[PDB]
Amino acid sequence: MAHHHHHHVDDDDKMGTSIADVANDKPYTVAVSGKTITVESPAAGLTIFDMNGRRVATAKNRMVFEAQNGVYAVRIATEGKTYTEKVIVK
């Protein structure tokens, strides 16, 4: 097809993502779906904290928990820099 040319992206340094072209090299992956909290991070200690910051759930690498309304705080600790995200479900 010489009429159109597509630019497919490969591994090793993203060439273009639909989520901030200057913020896709993150060593983790956060995803929320309604009342489901999914966090994937190859080799990393995950620990979810409820509104009161109390340990409500704990897992490693991949995690999946059905939480209800309320603010949360998922701490993704990776070898190098410990990140701290929050899940706000309304």
mmCIF file of N, CA and C in Angstrom:
data_model
loop_
_atom_site.group_PDB
_atom_site.id
_atom_site.type_symbol
_atom_site.label_atom_id
_atom_site.label_comp_id
_atom_site.label_asym_id
_atom_site.label_seq_id
_atom_site.Cartn_x
_atom_site.Cartn_y
_atom_site.Cartn_z
ATOM 1 N N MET A 1 0.842 -1.224 0.000
ATOM 2 C CA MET A 1 0.000 0.000 0.000
ATOM 3 C C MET A 1 0.865 1.257 0.000
ATOM 4 N N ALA A 2 0.995 1.878 -1.169
ATOM 5 C CA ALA A 2 1.792 3.092 -1.309
ATOM 6 C C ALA A 2 0.935 4.338 -1.120
ATOM 7 N N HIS A 3 -0.370 4.134 -0.978
ATOM 8 C CA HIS A 3 -1.305 5.239 -0.791
ATOM 9 C C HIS A 3 -1.283 5.737 0.649
ATOM 10 N N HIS A 4 -1.020 4.826 1.581
ATOM 11 C CA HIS A 4 -0.970 5.170 2.997
ATOM 12 C C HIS A 4 0.176 4.445 3.695
ATOM 13 N N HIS A 5 0.789 5.115 4.665
ATOM 14 C CA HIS A 5 1.900 4.536 5.412
ATOM 15 C C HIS A 5 1.653 4.631 6.914
ATOM 16 N N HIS A 6 1.628 3.479 7.578
ATOM 17 C CA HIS A 6 1.400 3.433 9.019
ATOM 18 C C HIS A 6 2.721 3.324 9.775
ATOM 19 N N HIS A 7 2.778 3.947 10.948
ATOM 20 C CA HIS A 7 3.981 3.923 11.773
ATOM 21 C C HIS A 7 3.769 3.060 13.015
ATOM 22 N N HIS A 8 4.074 1.771 12.896
ATOM 23 C CA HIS A 8 3.913 0.841 14.010
ATOM 24 C C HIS A 8 5.038 1.008 15.026
ATOM 25 N N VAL A 9 4.676 1.017 16.306
ATOM 26 C CA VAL A 9 5.652 1.171 17.379
ATOM 27 C C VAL A 9 6.138 -0.183 17.885
ATOM 28 N N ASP A 10 7.415 -0.250 18.248
ATOM 29 C CA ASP A 10 8.005 -1.485 18.748
ATOM 30 C C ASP A 10 8.533 -1.302 20.169
ATOM 31 N N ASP A 11 9.206 -2.329 20.679
ATOM 32 C CA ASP A 11 9.764 -2.284 22.026
ATOM 33 C C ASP A 11 10.988 -1.373 22.078
ATOM 34 N N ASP A 12 11.623 -1.311 23.247
ATOM 35 C CA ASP A 12 12.811 -0.479 23.442
ATOM 36 C C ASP A 12 12.524 0.983 23.110
ATOM 37 N N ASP A 13 12.209 1.768 24.141
ATOM 38 C CA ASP A 13 11.913 3.189 23.974
ATOM 39 C C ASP A 13 10.719 3.401 23.046
ATOM 40 N N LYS A 14 9.572 3.733 23.635
ATOM 41 C CA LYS A 14 8.357 3.967 22.862
ATOM 42 C C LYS A 14 8.563 5.088 21.849
ATOM 43 N N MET A 15 7.990 4.918 20.661
ATOM 44 C CA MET A 15 8.114 5.915 19.603
ATOM 45 C C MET A 15 6.906 6.846 19.589
ATOM 46 N N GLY A 16 5.855 6.452 20.301
ATOM 47 C CA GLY A 16 4.650 7.259 20.357
ATOM 48 C C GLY A 16 3.509 6.545 21.055
ATOM 49 N N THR A 17 3.142 7.034 22.235
ATOM 50 C CA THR A 17 2.060 6.434 23.007
ATOM 51 C C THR A 17 0.875 7.386 23.122
ATOM 52 N N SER A 18 -0.302 6.827 23.387
ATOM 53 C CA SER A 18 -1.515 7.624 23.522
ATOM 54 C C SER A 18 -1.655 8.169 24.939
ATOM 55 N N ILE A 19 -0.589 8.040 25.725
ATOM 56 C CA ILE A 19 -0.586 8.518 27.102
ATOM 57 C C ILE A 19 0.698 9.283 27.418
ATOM 58 N N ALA A 20 0.740 10.551 27.012
ATOM 59 C CA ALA A 20 1.909 11.398 27.246
ATOM 60 C C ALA A 20 3.150 10.823 26.568
ATOM 61 N N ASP A 21 3.538 11.430 25.451
ATOM 62 C CA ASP A 21 4.704 10.979 24.697
ATOM 63 C C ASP A 21 5.987 11.172 25.502
ATOM 64 N N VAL A 22 5.899 11.953 26.575
ATOM 65 C CA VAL A 22 7.052 12.215 27.427
ATOM 66 C C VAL A 22 6.892 11.551 28.790
ATOM 67 N N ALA A 23 6.020 10.551 28.856
ATOM 68 C CA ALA A 23 5.775 9.830 30.100
ATOM 69 C C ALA A 23 5.166 8.458 29.825
ATOM 70 N N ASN A 24 5.940 7.595 29.174
ATOM 71 C CA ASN A 24 5.483 6.249 28.845
ATOM 72 C C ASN A 24 6.535 5.208 29.220
ATOM 73 N N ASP A 25 7.682 5.684 29.695
ATOM 74 C CA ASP A 25 8.773 4.799 30.087
ATOM 75 C C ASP A 25 8.668 4.417 31.562
ATOM 76 N N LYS A 26 7.460 4.517 32.110
ATOM 77 C CA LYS A 26 7.228 4.178 33.510
ATOM 78 C C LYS A 26 7.402 2.677 33.743
ATOM 79 N N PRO A 27 8.043 2.285 34.862
ATOM 80 C CA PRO A 27 8.269 0.876 35.187
ATOM 81 C C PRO A 27 7.036 0.209 35.791
ATOM 82 N N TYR A 28 5.894 0.880 35.684
ATOM 83 C CA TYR A 28 4.645 0.351 36.219
ATOM 84 C C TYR A 28 3.485 0.633 35.270
ATOM 85 N N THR A 29 2.304 0.137 35.624
ATOM 86 C CA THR A 29 1.116 0.332 34.803
ATOM 87 C C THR A 29 -0.144 0.364 35.662
ATOM 88 N N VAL A 30 -0.743 1.545 35.780
ATOM 89 C CA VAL A 30 -1.956 1.710 36.575
ATOM 90 C C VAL A 30 -3.200 1.685 35.694
ATOM 91 N N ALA A 31 -4.237 0.999 36.164
ATOM 92 C CA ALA A 31 -5.485 0.897 35.420
ATOM 93 C C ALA A 31 -6.668 0.677 36.355
ATOM 94 N N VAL A 32 -7.678 1.532 36.229
ATOM 95 C CA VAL A 32 -8.876 1.435 37.057
ATOM 96 C C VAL A 32 -10.115 1.215 36.193
ATOM 97 N N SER A 33 -10.978 0.299 36.623
ATOM 98 C CA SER A 33 -12.198 -0.005 35.883
ATOM 99 C C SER A 33 -13.396 -0.115 36.821
ATOM 100 N N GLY A 34 -14.080 1.005 37.032
ATOM 101 C CA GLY A 34 -15.241 1.012 37.903
ATOM 102 C C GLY A 34 -14.876 0.831 39.364
ATOM 103 N N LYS A 35 -14.964 -0.405 39.842
ATOM 104 C CA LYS A 35 -14.645 -0.712 41.232
ATOM 105 C C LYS A 35 -13.474 -1.685 41.320
ATOM 106 N N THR A 36 -12.777 -1.871 40.203
ATOM 107 C CA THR A 36 -11.635 -2.775 40.153
ATOM 108 C C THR A 36 -10.322 -2.001 40.071
ATOM 109 N N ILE A 37 -9.385 -2.350 40.947
ATOM 110 C CA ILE A 37 -8.084 -1.692 40.979
ATOM 111 C C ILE A 37 -6.986 -2.649 40.527
ATOM 112 N N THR A 38 -6.461 -2.414 39.328
ATOM 113 C CA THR A 38 -5.409 -3.259 38.773
ATOM 114 C C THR A 38 -4.100 -2.489 38.621
ATOM 115 N N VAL A 39 -3.024 -3.052 39.162
ATOM 116 C CA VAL A 39 -1.708 -2.428 39.083
ATOM 117 C C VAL A 39 -0.638 -3.463 38.750
ATOM 118 N N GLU A 40 -0.013 -3.310 37.586
ATOM 119 C CA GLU A 40 1.027 -4.234 37.149
ATOM 120 C C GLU A 40 2.395 -3.562 37.149
ATOM 121 N N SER A 41 3.367 -4.219 37.775
ATOM 122 C CA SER A 41 4.725 -3.695 37.853
ATOM 123 C C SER A 41 5.730 -4.836 38.023
ATOM 124 N N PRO A 42 6.324 -5.320 36.912
ATOM 125 C CA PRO A 42 7.302 -6.415 36.946
ATOM 126 C C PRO A 42 8.324 -6.263 38.069
ATOM 127 N N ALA A 43 8.315 -7.216 38.999
ATOM 128 C CA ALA A 43 9.237 -7.202 40.129
ATOM 129 C C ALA A 43 9.118 -5.906 40.924
ATOM 130 N N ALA A 44 8.102 -5.834 41.780
ATOM 131 C CA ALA A 44 7.878 -4.653 42.604
ATOM 132 C C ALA A 44 6.890 -4.945 43.727
ATOM 133 N N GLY A 45 7.134 -4.348 44.890
ATOM 134 C CA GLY A 45 6.255 -4.550 46.027
ATOM 135 C C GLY A 45 5.104 -3.565 46.044
ATOM 136 N N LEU A 46 3.886 -4.080 45.927
ATOM 137 C CA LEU A 46 2.697 -3.236 45.920
ATOM 138 C C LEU A 46 1.961 -3.304 47.255
ATOM 139 N N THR A 47 1.453 -2.158 47.695
ATOM 140 C CA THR A 47 0.721 -2.072 48.952
ATOM 141 C C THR A 47 -0.344 -0.983 48.879
ATOM 142 N N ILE A 48 -1.607 -1.395 48.853
ATOM 143 C CA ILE A 48 -2.716 -0.452 48.772
ATOM 144 C C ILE A 48 -3.126 0.042 50.156
ATOM 145 N N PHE A 49 -3.378 1.344 50.259
ATOM 146 C CA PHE A 49 -3.787 1.951 51.521
ATOM 147 C C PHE A 49 -5.136 2.648 51.371
ATOM 148 N N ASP A 50 -6.031 2.399 52.320
ATOM 149 C CA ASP A 50 -7.359 3.001 52.299
ATOM 150 C C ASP A 50 -7.270 4.498 52.604
ATOM 151 N N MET A 51 -8.419 5.142 52.781
ATOM 152 C CA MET A 51 -8.457 6.573 53.073
ATOM 153 C C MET A 51 -7.649 6.903 54.325
ATOM 154 N N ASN A 52 -7.801 6.079 55.359
ATOM 155 C CA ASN A 52 -7.090 6.286 56.617
ATOM 156 C C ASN A 52 -5.617 5.902 56.489
ATOM 157 N N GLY A 53 -5.203 5.552 55.276
ATOM 158 C CA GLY A 53 -3.823 5.169 55.043
ATOM 159 C C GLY A 53 -3.471 3.848 55.697
ATOM 160 N N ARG A 54 -4.494 3.073 56.046
ATOM 161 C CA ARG A 54 -4.289 1.777 56.684
ATOM 162 C C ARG A 54 -4.172 0.671 55.640
ATOM 163 N N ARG A 55 -3.261 -0.266 55.885
ATOM 164 C CA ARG A 55 -3.046 -1.385 54.974
ATOM 165 C C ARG A 55 -4.337 -2.172 54.772
ATOM 166 N N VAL A 56 -4.893 -2.087 53.566
ATOM 167 C CA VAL A 56 -6.136 -2.780 53.247
ATOM 168 C C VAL A 56 -5.895 -3.976 52.327
ATOM 169 N N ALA A 57 -4.854 -3.892 51.504
ATOM 170 C CA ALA A 57 -4.522 -4.970 50.578
ATOM 171 C C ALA A 57 -3.029 -4.983 50.264
ATOM 172 N N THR A 58 -2.486 -6.173 50.015
ATOM 173 C CA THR A 58 -1.068 -6.314 49.704
ATOM 174 C C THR A 58 -0.828 -7.398 48.658
ATOM 175 N N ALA A 59 0.034 -7.092 47.693
ATOM 176 C CA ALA A 59 0.367 -8.037 46.632
ATOM 177 C C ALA A 59 1.688 -7.662 45.970
ATOM 178 N N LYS A 60 2.139 -8.504 45.047
ATOM 179 C CA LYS A 60 3.392 -8.264 44.342
ATOM 180 C C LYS A 60 3.202 -8.401 42.836
ATOM 181 N N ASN A 61 3.961 -7.612 42.079
ATOM 182 C CA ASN A 61 3.889 -7.630 40.620
ATOM 183 C C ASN A 61 2.509 -7.192 40.132
ATOM 184 N N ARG A 62 1.563 -8.126 40.124
ATOM 185 C CA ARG A 62 0.202 -7.835 39.684
ATOM 186 C C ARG A 62 -0.776 -7.916 40.854
ATOM 187 N N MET A 63 -1.737 -6.995 40.887
ATOM 188 C CA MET A 63 -2.730 -6.968 41.958
ATOM 189 C C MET A 63 -4.116 -6.633 41.416
ATOM 190 N N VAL A 64 -5.137 -7.219 42.034
ATOM 191 C CA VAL A 64 -6.520 -6.988 41.633
ATOM 192 C C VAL A 64 -7.454 -7.088 42.837
ATOM 193 N N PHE A 65 -8.108 -5.978 43.166
ATOM 194 C CA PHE A 65 -9.025 -5.940 44.300
ATOM 195 C C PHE A 65 -10.248 -5.083 43.985
ATOM 196 N N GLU A 66 -11.419 -5.565 44.392
ATOM 197 C CA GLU A 66 -12.664 -4.842 44.160
ATOM 198 C C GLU A 66 -12.978 -3.919 45.332
ATOM 199 N N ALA A 67 -12.673 -2.637 45.165
ATOM 200 C CA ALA A 67 -12.917 -1.650 46.209
ATOM 201 C C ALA A 67 -14.120 -0.777 45.873
ATOM 202 N N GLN A 68 -14.758 -0.234 46.906
ATOM 203 C CA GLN A 68 -15.923 0.624 46.720
ATOM 204 C C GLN A 68 -15.529 2.095 46.791
ATOM 205 N N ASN A 69 -16.529 2.972 46.817
ATOM 206 C CA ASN A 69 -16.289 4.411 46.879
ATOM 207 C C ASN A 69 -15.290 4.758 47.980
ATOM 208 N N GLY A 70 -14.434 5.738 47.704
ATOM 209 C CA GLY A 70 -13.438 6.153 48.674
ATOM 210 C C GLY A 70 -12.079 6.390 48.043
ATOM 211 N N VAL A 71 -11.229 7.140 48.737
ATOM 212 C CA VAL A 71 -9.892 7.440 48.239
ATOM 213 C C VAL A 71 -8.896 6.371 48.677
ATOM 214 N N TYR A 72 -7.944 6.061 47.803
ATOM 215 C CA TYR A 72 -6.933 5.054 48.100
ATOM 216 C C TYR A 72 -5.538 5.555 47.739
ATOM 217 N N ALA A 73 -4.529 4.759 48.072
ATOM 218 C CA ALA A 73 -3.144 5.117 47.789
ATOM 219 C C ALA A 73 -2.286 3.875 47.577
ATOM 220 N N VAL A 74 -2.020 3.554 46.315
ATOM 221 C CA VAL A 74 -1.210 2.390 45.981
ATOM 222 C C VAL A 74 0.264 2.765 45.879
ATOM 223 N N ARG A 75 1.080 2.171 46.743
ATOM 224 C CA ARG A 75 2.511 2.444 46.755
ATOM 225 C C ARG A 75 3.275 1.385 45.966
ATOM 226 N N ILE A 76 3.755 1.765 44.786
ATOM 227 C CA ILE A 76 4.509 0.850 43.936
ATOM 228 C C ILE A 76 6.008 1.044 44.134
ATOM 229 N N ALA A 77 6.615 0.166 44.927
ATOM 230 C CA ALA A 77 8.046 0.246 45.201
ATOM 231 C C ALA A 77 8.851 -0.558 44.189
ATOM 232 N N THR A 78 9.652 0.140 43.391
ATOM 233 C CA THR A 78 10.480 -0.507 42.383
ATOM 234 C C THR A 78 11.959 -0.296 42.684
ATOM 235 N N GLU A 79 12.789 -1.229 42.227
ATOM 236 C CA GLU A 79 14.228 -1.147 42.447
ATOM 237 C C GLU A 79 14.808 0.105 41.801
ATOM 238 N N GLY A 80 14.900 1.177 42.581
ATOM 239 C CA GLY A 80 15.435 2.426 42.073
ATOM 240 C C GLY A 80 14.697 3.636 42.611
ATOM 241 N N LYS A 81 13.395 3.695 42.352
ATOM 242 C CA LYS A 81 12.572 4.811 42.811
ATOM 243 C C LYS A 81 11.187 4.326 43.229
ATOM 244 N N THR A 82 10.834 4.573 44.488
ATOM 245 C CA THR A 82 9.538 4.161 45.012
ATOM 246 C C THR A 82 8.448 5.164 44.646
ATOM 247 N N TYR A 83 7.493 4.717 43.835
ATOM 248 C CA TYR A 83 6.388 5.569 43.409
ATOM 249 C C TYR A 83 5.185 5.405 44.332
ATOM 250 N N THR A 84 4.359 6.444 44.414
ATOM 251 C CA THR A 84 3.170 6.410 45.258
ATOM 252 C C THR A 84 1.968 7.013 44.539
ATOM 253 N N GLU A 85 1.119 6.147 43.996
ATOM 254 C CA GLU A 85 -0.076 6.587 43.284
ATOM 255 C C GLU A 85 -1.306 6.490 44.182
ATOM 256 N N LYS A 86 -2.412 7.076 43.732
ATOM 257 C CA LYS A 86 -3.654 7.054 44.497
ATOM 258 C C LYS A 86 -4.842 6.736 43.593
ATOM 259 N N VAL A 87 -5.764 5.917 44.090
ATOM 260 C CA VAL A 87 -6.944 5.540 43.320
ATOM 261 C C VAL A 87 -8.199 6.185 43.896
ATOM 262 N N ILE A 88 -8.754 7.143 43.160
ATOM 263 C CA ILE A 88 -9.955 7.845 43.596
ATOM 264 C C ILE A 88 -11.183 7.359 42.832
ATOM 265 N N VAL A 89 -11.977 6.510 43.478
ATOM 266 C CA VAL A 89 -13.182 5.969 42.863
ATOM 267 C C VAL A 89 -14.430 6.690 43.371
ATOM 268 N N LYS A 90 -15.247 7.171 42.439
ATOM 269 C CA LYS A 90 -16.472 7.883 42.788
ATOM 270 C C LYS A 90 -17.673 7.284 42.064
#
